[PDB]
C-alpha cells in the first residue's frame, strides 16, 4: 500500500549538513543541503537528493502535505506548498518521495532548493550545476509540436515500487552541544533534557561517564567539561559532510525511488 510503502522510512530521520552557499554567500549549516544531482534520463528530468525528507510527519506517520526536517536535536514540520526549486527561472516539480525530488528546469548554471521554516523563515541551499538539455533526435526544439514523429527515449517513472538501486544507512554519531551547561557559584550543572548525555570532565578525578539526569560537579569551570548527545536510536544517511561513528560497518539499506524506464 501507499502507506505501507514507507515501512522502511519509519527507521530513518533527516539530518543537518554543511551548505557552502545558503542564499547570501555565507557558508552555513542547513537542513536542506544538496548531496548529488543525477541526470541519466535523456528527457531532462533532474533527480535531486537532499537531507530533508518529504512525505512523513514528526509523529512518524504518512502525510503527503508535510515535510519533516531536523532542527536542533528535534524534528519539525513544514508545509509542502512551500518548496521551490530554481536554476535560472522557476522550475516545475513533477514528483517527490522521501530524500528525492524529481523535477525539470530551464537552462542555467546554479541549482537552488528552498523551504519554509516553522517561524516562517526561508532555508535555502544552492550549488553549481551546469545544466542544459538537448532533446533526442536531430532537431534542437523546445516545445512539443502538435504533429510529428515518435522516437524512443528514457525517462523516470513516478512508481514508488521497490527497485534494485539502493542507498546506505549508518548510525548517527554523537553531536556535541554547549547549551546543556550552567555555572552556579563554583560548580557546573548539566541537564539531561530527556536524552542520554556522555560527559568528560578534566577537573578532579573520575568525572567521566554517561548520565540521564541533571547533575552538578563541584569546583569545576564551564569550559572544563564536554557533554554530547549519545542516544541516536534512529539511522542517518552516510554523507561525506558528517563524521562516522565508531563502528565502521554498514547498518542498513534503503531502496531508491523513481527508476529509469523506456
Ligand X SMILES: *[C@@H]1O[C@H](CO)[C@@H](O[C@@H]2O[C@H](CO)[C@@H](O)[C@H](O)[C@H]2NC(C)=O)[C@H](O)[C@H]1NC(C)=O
> What residues make contact with a second copy under the rule CB under 8 A?
18, 20-21, 25, 27, 88, 106, 109-110, 126-128, 141-146
Of 226 and 255, which has the nearer Cβ to other proteins? 226
Half-sphere exposure for 111 (CA within 13 Å, toward CB) = 25
205 binds ligand X per the rule CB under 6 A: no
**Which residue number, 40 or 166, has a Cβ lying nearer to ligand X?**
40
Using the minimum distance from each CB to other proteins, give the nearer residue, 82 or 200.
200
Contact residue for ligand X among 179, 182, 200, 216 (CB under 6 A): 200
Is residue 248 close enough to count as binding other proteins by CB under 8 A?
yes
Residue 163 as a binder of other proteins (CB under 8 A): the answer is no
Write the binding mask 89 to 108 for ligand X: x where contact by CB under 6 A, - elsewhere: --------------------
Q: By CB under 8 A, tell whether 110 contacts other proteins.
A: no
CA-CA distance, 136 to 154, in Å (whole number)?
A: 10
Beta strand 208-211 with 197-201: parallel, antiparallel or unpaired?
A: antiparallel
One-character DSSP codes across 180-192: TEEEETTEEEE--
Task: Quote the cell numbers at residue 181.
Answer: 551547561
The phi, psi pair for 91, rounded to 5°, reads -80, -175
Only segment of 90-98, 104-112, 113-121, 238-246 that touches other proteins (CB under 8 A) = 238-246
Distance, in Å, from the CA atom of 203 to the CA atom of 223, rounded to the nearest integer, reads 10
Minimum CB distance to other proteins, residue 129 (Å) = 14
- For residues 191 and 202, what is the distance between their CA atoms, to the nearest angstrom? 18
Query: How many residues touch ligand X (CB under 6 A)?
Result: 7
How far are the Cα atoms of 15, 20, 69, 95 from residue 127, in angstroms, in the given order? 18, 8, 20, 21
Q: For other proteins, what does the binding mask look like between residues 194 and 233, x meaning CB under 8 A? A: ------x-x-----------------------x-------
What's the angle, vertex CA 222, arms to CA 221 and CA 223, rounded to 5?
95
Where do contacts with other proteins occur on this chain (CB under 8 A)? 16, 18, 29, 146-147, 170, 175-179, 200, 202, 226, 238-244, 248
Amino acid at each position: 500500500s501507499v502507506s505501507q510503502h514507507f515501512n522502511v522510512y519509519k527507521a530513518t530521520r533527516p539530518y543537518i549538513a554543511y551548505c557552502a552557499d545558503c542564499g547570501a554567500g555565507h557558508s552555513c549549516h542547513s537542513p536542506v543541503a544538496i548531496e548529488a544531482v543525477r541526470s541519466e534520463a535523456t528527457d531532462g528530468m533532474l533527480k535531486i537528493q537532499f537531507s530533508a525528507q518529504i512525505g512523513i510527519d514528526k509523529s512518524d506517520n504518512h502525510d503527503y502535505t508535510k515535510i519533516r526536517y531536523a532542527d536542533g536535536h528535534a524534528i519539525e514540520n513544514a508545509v509542502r506548498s512551500s518548496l521551490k526549486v530554481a536554476t535560472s527561472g522557476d522550475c516545475f516539480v513533477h514528483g517527490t518521495m522521501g530524500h528525492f525530488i524529481l523535477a525539470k528546469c530551464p537552462p542555467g548554471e546554479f541549482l537552488q532548493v528552498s523551504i519554509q521554516d516553522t517561524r516562517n523563515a526561508v532555508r535555502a541551499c544552492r550549488i553549481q550545476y551546469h545544466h542544459d538539455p538537448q532533446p533526442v533526435g536531430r532537431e534542437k526544439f523546445t516545445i512539443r509540436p502538435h504533429y510529428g514523429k515518435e522516437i524512443p527515449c528514457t525517462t523516470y517513472q513516478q512508481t514508488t515500487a521497490k527497485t534494485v538501486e539502493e542507498i546506505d544507512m549508518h548510525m548517527p554519531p554523537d553531536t556535541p552541544d554547549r547549551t546543556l551547561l550552567s555555572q552556579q557559584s563554583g560548580n557546573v550543572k548539566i541537564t539531561v533534557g530527556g536524552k542520554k548525555v556522555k560527559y568528560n570532565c578534566t577537573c578532579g578525578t573520575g568525572n567521566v561517564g554517561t548520565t540521564n539526569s541533571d547533575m552538578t560537579i563541584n569546583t569545576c569551570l564551564i569550559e572544563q567539561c564536554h557533554v554530547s548527545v549519545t542516544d541516536h536510536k534512529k539511522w542517518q544517511f552516510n554523507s561525506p559532510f558528517v563524521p562516522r561513528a565508531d563502528e565502521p560497518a554498514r547498518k542498513g539499506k534503503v531502496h531508491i525511488p523513481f527508476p529509469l524506464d523506456n
